[PDB]
Design a protein around this ligand. Structure first.
Ligand SMILES: CC(=O)SCCNC(=O)CCNC(=O)[C@H](O)C(C)(C)COP(=O)(O)OP(=O)(O)OC[C@H]1O[C@@H](n2cnc3c(N)ncnc32)[C@H](O)[C@@H]1OP(=O)(O)O
Ligand SMILES: CC(=O)SCCNC(=O)CCNC(=O)[C@H](O)C(C)(C)COP(=O)(O)OP(=O)(O)OC[C@H]1O[C@@H](n2cnc3c(N)ncnc32)[C@H](O)[C@@H]1OP(=O)(O)O
Ligand SMILES: *[C@@H]1O[C@H](CO)[C@@H](O[C@@H]2O[C@H](CO)[C@@H](O)[C@H](O)[C@H]2NC(C)=O)[C@H](O)[C@H]1NC(C)=O
Ligand SMILES: *[C@@H]1O[C@H](CO)[C@@H](O)[C@H](O)[C@H]1NC(C)=O
Ligand SMILES: *[C@@H]1O[C@H](CO)[C@@H](O)[C@H](O)[C@H]1NC(C)=O
Ligand SMILES: *[C@@H]1O[C@H](CO)[C@@H](O)[C@H](O)[C@H]1NC(C)=O
Ligand SMILES: *[C@@H]1O[C@H](CO)[C@@H](O)[C@H](O)[C@H]1NC(C)=O
Ligand SMILES: *[C@@H]1O[C@H](CO)[C@@H](O)[C@H](O)[C@H]1NC(C)=O
Lengths: 548, 541
């Protein structure tokens, strides 16, 4: 009857001489049009109101505006938040103006109230018990037959493993929860964090591997060849394997999505690694005093790259806020569709979307952006577009900066911690200035689809804080080893390609008894993520590390 | 036009007034099929204006048309014609009743120009493109620099031939009928790879077992390795290879338990454990026959297993079905056994695994219109798969016992090939549908096993001197997949739909485009195997 995250709204219209139409919009919309929910006829006679049934969305908030069909006047307005499976009744009547009362016939399922952390810890206990029993069964079976007859940081690795586990969880569905999906246009969800963290970690590893290779006595040209080959392979693997849905049919060139996650990673890797190789200064030595020296030797040594990154960021800001888009406001950052009151429907992405549609074409972009379900956008927008690559490069260079911090001051963790704290604080201040700590307001609101500058600064401050926490615990104090996380940290590309390839396979996806149940989807996605962690751990035990 | 691939437009118009015509169709290859209706041709309203009809007749191989008056059910005429692909034929029936079937436009051969010189042209194109890709990329790098126990290889070649053929026929084989699995009885090019794979698996079982045991390894560690490999093969087949995940998520009550890799694992376990249990060191000749008497317990057990297969096939009473039924069911055998596909083997696997846990689209479903699910890699045929794996083990025994006696190996290979060919001739009477046990991949018939074993022994007889002794030709396109068989199979199952192997065609009703796509995909899989060989990334177990 009712789908997932969808209540039932019964609308009894007791008025005699007024047609009734009901409009609905979410509270997550910034400026959305009022979609038609249902049209309720007038009551044929007193005491027998006419009723119409509507299925309202539950995920986040709801606004109801009831208007007459004849005169189009506001009868009454509602801002109720509905439950996942409810039988709400909306009675409109003339008590005198007209007073409408909303009644909850059946109480909500109250999603996230029942599962809480109790269900999650129970599922973890169950899977741990099953894994232990499976491990112990091998010994009993064997006995029965026998009776008859530089080193890796591991903080970067734990960070990458956290990102990979979260990415596998949110990519497989994340329980089909709205906060485990990418945000529609603006704001930040759990699924919007992993990709910037992946780019940040990629930049950090770029600096780490490049400086290790250069200090081992390697030529710059061979390293450039390796960088070019890796970027080319990333782009090709993305385009051929990761982007297309091969269950829909054979891959035609006219409908090939050129941009993608791996294409963005390859392009940014090439750009920032080539910048690092062009300006590659050896890691110098400190004063060996530990007396709060606070030397800015890890920024002035890279001012080449800082100047070029600032030029690229200025280019991104100019192309975003200044490039004229035909039939579209200059400097448009909205989602289009019904967003911004539906006056710019074919404007999803503004300048970034325009540049993507111009250079690559509509057919070669992402056909189903995140805004399509909330703002009802019809144009194809690619989150990993062309303008966003500039900010992807900027964040990869911030990750390179983190690697420079943790390599220049490798001797003392005090300097590393202060550098990480200062960078996190500065990036957080920049993000607060840009977005005014607001989801949809601010100069540049946080936006994964546009890869906003505030998106980059917010997620970079998050990654710097994550490093500030993980580096002492995992490395200096050694209190933790990233115990379940670092195996994906070592087999990141294998995990990504595998879960993009084996997404529909049985251990990661099976048929559920109820597909509208959040609990079943969450159980399946958690099991699949745990199985990918298990696969990464098994490969780690076998010393198998696929590297490009 | 509206003509699908392998179809001809048949325009039937009758210049007659006082009879209604219904046209029946029956492909020539089917053994005993009911005449399925094709089209109903009504009376012409008046003389001089025949009433026309349209029908798309299959042109894969032959066609028999039964035109009988639907009012009285008497055949006005019956003609057997080999229609051409994309043809346009006018079956004119009128009083003199005479049927002629004139030709309106010429058909398309679809096989001669596509495989006479098109194959050479495509091979030239692919080798030129590969050379250009390998050279131009390296040309830029060279220009920039200026500015700045051993494997036999005949078994490997045989396995690579089987893998190339399997990749070609699984991907479609150009959608040609002779590159698909035969509808029930008979042999096609696609019906040879799996028995060859089982034969090679048995030969490799013996070679690996002898090497491991002569190296001093214990029998229990080897038994654990056997069990682990069989379990892994079964699990891979069940989880990765069998399901079509493009349809939807996997449910237990709709999962195909049998399969290619499951059967390979079961036969590997049985044959390898038999060899390990009755394991003897190879001794150290013109007329010795020692490699047959040494494995007399295994031969006795294989004879008992074959007798059990014969007894279950020809004596097990299947309810609602004739005993010893080797036919395909459906409209085959005059449609008197509509649900009898496989007979005893189908009954056994339906009773033990259920209709849901079988292959829901048997190869006979298109020709004989069978409605039951029959699994070619079922339960009863696993006995014959074990037998053919043991024949492969015998080939490995021949290879290893007479290692230094090439003439002895050749004599043994030709003797086994001739003996198994004689058995196949006796069982089939050289006939696809006649004989005591006709050749059948779906049933994995005993004569199927013996025919493919004689073929494999002849292949080995031709390959052993050339690739090993005389060194005339290493399996230079073939051993590269031969040493990565499991990777090639699993990858081509997983990446079947991916771009290098599949892309959207200009028209899917074209044998030329499909053949080009499948040959390109097979060549790309050979190239992937060669790349893995060059980097030594042989995946095993
Ligand atoms: C939005 C969603 O929900 S889905 C979006 C998902 N986004 C993604 O980016 C997922 C896919 N991406 C990835 O998996 C990764 O970003 C990758 C594989 C592309 C890049 O991984 P990277 O972080 O660049 O590191 P990778 O493991 O490939 O190794 C690169 C180099 O860094 C080195 N390195 C890695 N970790 C460390 C470490 N902790 N310390 C030192 N060196 C390290 C490696 O040794 C290697 O150098 P080498 O080749 O000279 O030996
Ligand atoms: C019907 C259709 O169109 S599709 C159906 C066809 N598909 C199939 O049959 C599935 C694909 N099959 C296969 O890939 C293979 O048959 C397999 C991998 C499943 C079977 O493995 P095998 O054929 O025995 O070969 P594999 O390469 O795995 O060799 C296994 C052992 O034999 C040894 N071996 C293999 N070839 C040789 C050789 N030429 N000389 C010596 N030893 C050899 C290996 O060393 C290994 O022993 P080890 O563990 O001691 O090292
Ligand atoms: C529902 O009715 C209200 C009230 O009549 C509408 O809001 C006002 O009226 C016009 C449209 O008639 C709006 O454009 C104005 O912005 C509102 N204020 C004033 C002062 O007019 C509302 O637009 C109606 N909703 C729909 C979907 O028709
Ligand atoms: C209400 O809607 C009905 C449509 O069924 C229409 O016939 C009627 O005239 C409407 N009444 C008013 C007051 O608009
Ligand atoms: C909702 O409640 C009304 C009365 O309270 C009842 O008639 C109706 O069947 C209920 N609907 C559902 C889906 O439970
Ligand atoms: C042939 O069929 C047509 C319509 O189906 C019918 O009108 C006619 O009477 C039939 N002729 C004979 C001889 O049955
Ligand atoms: C067509 O009619 C003839 C008349 O003898 C009959 O023998 C034949 O079986 C018919 N074809 C069918 C029923 O398919
Ligand atoms: C087949 O030939 C006839 C000749 O009368 C013609 O009318 C018909 O259009 C042809 N069919 C096609 C598909 O061209």
């Amino acid at each position: 009857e009712l789908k997932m995250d969808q209540a039932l709204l019964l609308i009894h219209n007791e008025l005699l001489w007024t047609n009734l139409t009901v409009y609905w919009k979410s509270e997550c919309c910034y400026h959305c049009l009022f979609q038609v929910l249902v049209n309720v006829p007038q009551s044929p006679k007193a005491g027998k109101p006419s009723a119409a049934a509507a299925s309202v969305s539950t995920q986040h908030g709801s606004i109801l505006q009831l208007n007459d069909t004849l005169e189009e006047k506001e009868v009454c307005r509602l801002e109720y938040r509905f439950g996942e499976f409810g039988n709400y009744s909306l009675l409109v009547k003339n008590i005198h103006e007209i007073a409408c009362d909303l009644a909850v016939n059946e109480d909500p399922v109250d999603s996230n109230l029942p599962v809480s952390i109790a269900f999650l810890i129970g599922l973890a206990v169950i899977i741990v018990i099953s894994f232990l029993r499976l491990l112990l069964s091998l010994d009993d079976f064997n006995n029965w037959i026998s009776k008859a007859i530089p080193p890796r940081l591991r903080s970067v690795d734990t960070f990458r493993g956290i990102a990979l586990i979260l990415m596998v969880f949110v990519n497989y569905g994340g329980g089909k929860y709205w906060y485990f999906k990418h945000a529609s246009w603006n704001g930040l969800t759990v699924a919007d964090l992993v990709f910037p963290w992946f780019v940040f970690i990629m930049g950090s590893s770029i600096f780490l591997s490049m400086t290790s290779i250069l200090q081992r006595g390697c030529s710059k040209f061979r390293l450039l060849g390796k960088i070019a080959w890796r970027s080319f392979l990333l782009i090709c693997i993305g385009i051929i394997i990761v982007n297309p849905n091969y269950c829909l049919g054979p891959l035609s060139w006219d409908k090939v999505r050129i941009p993608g996650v791996l294409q963005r990673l390859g392009v940014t890797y090439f750009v920032v690694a080539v910048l690092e190789l062009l300006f590659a200064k050896p890691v110098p030595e400190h004063c060996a005093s530990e007396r709060s020296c606070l030397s800015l030797r890890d920024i002035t040594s890279s001012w080449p790259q800082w100047l070029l990154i600032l030029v690229l960021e200025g280019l991104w800001l100019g192309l975003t806020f200044l490039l004229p888009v035909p039939g579209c406001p200059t400097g448009y950052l909205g989602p289009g569709g019904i967003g911004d009151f539906g006056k710019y429907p074919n404007c999803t992405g503004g300048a970034a979307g325009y540049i993507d549609r111009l250079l690559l074409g509509d057919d070669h972009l992402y056909q189903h952006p995140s805004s399509a379900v909330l703002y009802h956008t019809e144009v194809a927008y690619d989150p990993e577009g062309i303008l966003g690559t500039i900010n992807s490069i900027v964040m990869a260079f911030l990750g390179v900066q983190a690697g420079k911090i943790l390599l220049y001051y490798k001797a003392r963790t005090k300097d590393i911690l202060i550098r990480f704290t200062a960078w996190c604080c500065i990036l957080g201040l920049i993000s607060v200035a840009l977005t005014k700590v607001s989801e949809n307001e601010g100069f540049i609101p946080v936006n994964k689809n546009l890869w906003s500058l505030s998106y980059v600064t917010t997620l970079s401050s998050f990654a710097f804080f994550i490093l500030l926490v993980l580096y002492p615990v995992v490395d200096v104090k050694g209190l933790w080893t990233g115990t379940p996380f670092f195996y994906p940290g070592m087999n990141s590309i294998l995990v990504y390609v595998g879960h993009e390839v084996f997404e529909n396979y049985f251990p990661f996806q099976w048929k559920l008894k109820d597909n509208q149940s959040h609990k079943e989807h969450l159980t399946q996605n958690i099991v699949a993520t745990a199985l990918w962690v298990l696969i990464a751990y098994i490969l780690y035990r076998k010393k198998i590390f696929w590297k490009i």
